[PDB]
């Protein structure tokens, strides 16, 4: 998940590539039907806003 | 300066050409002449002229102040190059060869223009002396020089908008189209009359206006006459101020076919005297009335020829001869009966009238490669 | 001073009161400075809609583009939507009244027939479909009756007392080719009567069409 | 700005179908683009 | 007839002046190539 | 030239033809930042910066 | 011999199973938008004449941006439903291929595709898995990357103004991206969804409220009233979570008891305003 970054590492880049895949997935140009999704942490402060 | 240049040509055409009005032309042409260092271009008009026995001097402190100018371009010219800016020699002249343009002949404007068409980088000054270039080449009619640098202007607008040099531009073709015989060419150049100014050339608005109206009425028929010059509040209101054209264009529109031709006397009349138009003035009316005769002779199929006299134009045998003369010219389709005094008309189909236009091309294009095959290749 | 909403209405009632008493490109500039002025406000939430229906008027007062007009008097009857009756029922008078003068009157029965029309059902209404039905079977005297019936809506307002005279050459050419379609060579006394008109300001009108 | 008006006053022109930009295109113009110098 | 070179240290930009460009100072040996030439800089 | 294609053949790689010019690098950093190319006659009233 | 032309990603938007139907109608109260987009995408698209015949220079692509949940995704379906034009609709996280050279391979087919096909129009969206600022000339992840944005800065350059092909492209953060991509001649008109406010708040309540029952009595304007800073993406989740809040109850009518309950529930702020500091 992560939040974003201004892009410290090169590992990073290549994340939130894996990352905005999903994000896309969910409600972009699809009727996202019958397919529920469940997700847990310990801790939501180190996430996306967009997700 | 090439601005008030045009009034020079028209007032060469009002010296010459009207004979007896020979005396008021040569007075105000010289008040125009032997002042502003003008030397060049009326030698052959002093000739045309009377005597004038003592020019000399009136001559010798004016070429002495072409030198003065051409002197201090003499003294330009090294202290220019000593210290540069973007070629100051040519970059002053650039400005001063219109001068030398006016005062001077093409000589020495057509080596210090294409000099200083190299020198600026941006067609913004380049367009501008293509506009100086069409001007002299209408005054000393370059019918085939203009046909180059038109190209040469049409060719810099496309890169950039350059309305003002589009519009402007629109206006110099719209008075070749009419200086040759193409009316349906410099009405449609004449097309806007908005974004027409208030030129140098056409100093007035209105006598442009009176311009694109004499050839609107010969261009396009009457679904478009009823739509654009009788409803465009940019043509209305500049005729407003007109009382014989306002009259003469509507004459033909409201049918008030006895009232049109007494305002066309007057147009002619005046066609005649105006320049540019007097090469082609007996054109024009004998195409107006020919455009007056069919308009009102294909509403009806069984006119007589004695009710066109009271309500039409007086003189039943005035009609009679100038109809016998158009159908014998293989046009105004109709056919004139003599002895039971009626008009009959027909309608023939556009298939022959069509067809002949096609036969003369055919023979002319024909002749024109017969004649080149025969000349090349021995 | 501190106000600039309110200049907007007063230069809005100066653009009435040239118009109404006759003097249009005085109106065409206080209309102008009402534009200006109303492009500066964070709210306009009911003041657009008001400026949007003379936006109209005297656009189409000089009867250049109807379709532009048309609209300004859409977009004025949007605003007076579900919140101020008087206004909103005289919107539909000058949209429909433009739609017959563009000459396509089957869309003003399509508009009526739409729910949010549906519900602004009334006197004047009835006024313009019955116009727009006399305008659909094309005919004079159809467009006669409808005069007199409604004449109290119809022939009271001071824009329609100019534009029923231009309407009237428009539908007296529609009938005009509708009864001359069927044939052939013909009489001209009979489509005198067959129109119930005169014969000579008919011959002229006749003749008019095909020059 | 300068570009940002006279560029903005043929929208007003294509707006209503018109091939020709009017003076009154210009002054409609400036008042939504200093609109935007007077917000923030 | 001036090279106008601007410079704003992106790194689209970095693949054609050198590998890693440890300095700033690589940048000349482009520009004493088009030898009368002028370099920019923005804000 | 230095830094100019060639063609080359396969079996022994043996030089085979010159192959054109193809771009300076230079040139390829100002078409990836496309400045507005301008001159003196767009200049709006700036005389004595000039 | 030569080809007809060819892509698999994407293919062309099938047009029969493929238009996301959702209308101009059910996206309330973005009236400045709606109508700018408009002037942008699909008015020189037909009307390319006036923009010839004024002169204007029509816009060649257009980069919408903002916050997320403002109908950045939304309002380009509704583009795509009432289009007359071809529409081309990628993910721009699969240029990203694991061989070397596919993805600028993949890169200049979809403009030849746009080139072959029509006057088209080109959808990319998170162009910031593409567009970034830093990157690394050492690892090859990144090398890759470094190839795709000089392809279509390269692409997008090679257009003659005759062509009829429209890019409109979406982010969520602006400023994760390389200023080299809005220069104008590539990237001219810049579009930000900001959040609405309360003007353009009732008017979302109006267009998503349309649909369920909401029994008779139930006022929306004492919701509009309030502040706190509330998206278009939520206040459908509003509407979303009381209808359910009702079908638990087995009762298949909106009461006015529902909202005040699902209100609370979904954004769930808590003050962060210690009140000593006015
Ligand atoms: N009129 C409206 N205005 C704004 N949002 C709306 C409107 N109607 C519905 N929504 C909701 O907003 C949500 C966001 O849509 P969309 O994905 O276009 O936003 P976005 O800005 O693209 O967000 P993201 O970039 O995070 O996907 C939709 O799922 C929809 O539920
Ligand atoms: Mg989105």
């Known amino acids: 998940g992560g939040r974003r970054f201004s892009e410290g590492t090169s590992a990073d880049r290549e994340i939130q590539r894996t990352l905005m895949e999903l994000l896309n997935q969910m409600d972009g140009f699809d009727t996202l039907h019958r397919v529920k999704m469940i997700m847990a942490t310990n801790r939501p402060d180190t996430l996306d806003p967009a997700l | 300066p090439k601005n008030p240049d045009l009034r020079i040509a028209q007032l060469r055409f009002l010296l010459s050409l009207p004979e007896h009005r020979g005396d008021a032309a040569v007075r105000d042409e010289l008040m125009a002449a032997v002042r502003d260092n003008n030397m060049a271009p009326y030698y052959e008009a002093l000739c045309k002229s009377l005597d004038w026995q003592i020019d000399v001097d009136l001559l010798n402190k004016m070429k002495k102040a072409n030198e003065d100018e051409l002197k201090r371009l003499d003294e330009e010219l090294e202290d220019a190059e000593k210290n540069l800016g973007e070629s100051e020699i040519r970059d002053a002249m650039m400005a001063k060869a219109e001068y030398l343009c006016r005062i001077g002949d093409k000589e020495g404007a057509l080596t210090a223009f294409r000099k200083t068409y190299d020198k600026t980088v941006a067609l913004g000054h380049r367009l501008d002396i293509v506009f100086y270039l069409l001007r002299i080449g209408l005054f000393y009619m370059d019918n085939d020089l203009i046909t180059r640098n038109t190209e040469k202007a049409k060719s810099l607008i496309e890169e950039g908008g350059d309305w003002d040099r589009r519009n402007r531009l629109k206006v110099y073709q719209g008075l070749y189209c009419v200086a040759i015989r193409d009316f349906k060419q410099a009405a449609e150049l004449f097309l806007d009359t908005v974004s027409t100014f208030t030129s140098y050339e056409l100093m007035d608005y209105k006598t442009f206006v009176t311009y694109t109206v004499y050839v609107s009425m010969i261009a396009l028929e009457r679904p478009d006459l009823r739509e654009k010059v009788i409803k465009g509040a940019e043509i209305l209101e500049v005729l407003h101020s007109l009382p014989a054209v306002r009259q003469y264009l509507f004459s033909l529109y409201e049918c008030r076919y006895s009232v049109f031709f007494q305002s066309l006397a007057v147009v002619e009349q005046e066609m005649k005297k105006d320049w540019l138009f007097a090469p082609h003035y007996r054109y024009y009316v004998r195409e107006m009335r020919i455009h007056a005769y069919s308009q009102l002779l294909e509403s009806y199929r069984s006119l007589t020829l004695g009710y066109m006299a009271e309500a039409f134009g007086v003189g039943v045998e005035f009609i009679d001869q100038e109809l016998s003369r158009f159908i014998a010219a293989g046009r105004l389709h109709c056919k004139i009966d003599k002895v039971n005094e009626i008009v009959e008309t027909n309608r023939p189909d556009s298939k022959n009238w069509q067809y002949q236009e096609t036969i003369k091309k055919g023979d002319l294009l024909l002749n024109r490669v017969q004649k080149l095959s025969r000349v090349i290749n021995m | ?211 | 700005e300068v570009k940002g008006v006279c560029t903005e006053a043929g929208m007003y022109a294509l707006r209503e179908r018109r091939v020709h930009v009017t003076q009154e295109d210009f002054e409609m113009a400036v008042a939504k683009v200093m609109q935007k110098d007077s917000e923030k | 007839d001036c090279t106008f070179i601007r410079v704003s240290g992106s790194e689209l930009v970095q693949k054609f002046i050198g590998e890693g460009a440890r300095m700033v100072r690589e940048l000349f040996v482009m520009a004493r190539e088009h030898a009368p030439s002028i370099i920019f800089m923005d804000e | 030239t230095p830094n100019c294609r060639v063609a080359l053949r396969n079996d022994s790689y043996t030089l085979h033809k010159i192959l054109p010019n193809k771009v300076d690098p230079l040139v390829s950093l100002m078409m990836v930042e496309k400045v507005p190319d301008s001159t003196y006659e767009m200049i709006g009233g700036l005389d004595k910066q000039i | 011999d030569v080809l007809p032309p060819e892509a698999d990603s994407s293919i062309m938007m099938l047009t029969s199973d493929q238009k996301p139907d959702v209308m101009y109608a059910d996206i309330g109260g973005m009236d400045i938008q709606k109508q700018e987009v408009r002037e942008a995408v699909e008015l020189p698209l037909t009307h390319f004449e006036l923009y010839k015949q004024i002169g204007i220079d029509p816009p060649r692509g257009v980069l919408m941006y903002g916050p997320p949940g403002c109908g950045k995704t939304m309002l380009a379906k509704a583009v795509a439903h009432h289009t007359t034009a071809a529409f081309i609709r990628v993910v721009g996280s699969e240029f990203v291929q694991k061989y070397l050279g596919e993805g600028p391979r993949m890169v200049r087919d979809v403009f030849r595709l746009a080139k072959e096909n029509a006057p088209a129009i080109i959808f990319i969206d998170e162009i910031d898995a593409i567009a970034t600022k830093r990157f690394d000339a050492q690892t090859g992840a990144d090398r890759e990357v470094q190839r795709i944005l000089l392809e279509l800065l390269n692409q997008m350059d090679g257009f003659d103004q005759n062509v009829n092909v429209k890019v409109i492209m979406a982010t969520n953060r602006a400023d994760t991206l390389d200023p080299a991509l809005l220069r104008p001649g590539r990237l001219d008109r810049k579009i930000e969804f900001p959040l609405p406010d309360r003007r353009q708040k009732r008017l979302i309540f109006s267009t998503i409220t349309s649909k369920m029952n909401l029994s008779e009595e139930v006022d929306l304007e004492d919701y509009v009233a309030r502040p706190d800073k509330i998206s278009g993406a939520d206040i459908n989740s509003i509407c979303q979570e009381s209808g359910m809040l009702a079908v638990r109850e087995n009762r298949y009518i909106v009461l006015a008891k529902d909202f005040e309950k699902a209100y609370k529930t979904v954004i769930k702020k808590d003050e962060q305003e210690h009140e000593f500091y006015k």
């Open chain 3, 1 to 211: 001073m501190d106000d600039k909403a309110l200049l907007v209405e007063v230069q809005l009632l100066e653009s009435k009161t040239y118009h109404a008493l006759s003097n249009l490109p005085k109106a065409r500039a206080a209309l102008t400075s009402a534009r200006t002025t109303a492009n500066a406000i964070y709210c306009p939430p009911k003041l657009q809609a008001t400026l949007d229906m003379q936006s109209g008027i005297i656009h189409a007062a000089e009867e250049k583009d109807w379709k532009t007009a048309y609209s300004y008097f859409y977009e004025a009857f949007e605003g007076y939507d579900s919140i101020d009756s008087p206004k909103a029922i005289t919107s539909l008078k000058y949209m429909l009244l433009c739609k017959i003068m563009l000459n396509t009157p089957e869309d003003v029965q399509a508009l009526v027939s739409g729910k949010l029309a549906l519900r602004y059902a009334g006197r004047q209404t009835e006024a313009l479909k019955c116009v727009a039905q006399a305008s659909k079977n094309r005919s004079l005297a159809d467009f006669e009756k409808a005069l007199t019936d409604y004449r109290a809506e119809l022939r009271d307002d001071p824009i329609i007392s100019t534009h029923l005279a231009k309407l009237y050459d428009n539908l007296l050419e529609q009938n005009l080719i509708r009864v001359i379609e069927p044939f052939s060579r013909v009489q001209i006394e009979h489509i005198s009567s067959l129109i119930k008109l005169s014969k000579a300001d008919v011959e002229r009108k006749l003749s008019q069409m095909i020059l």
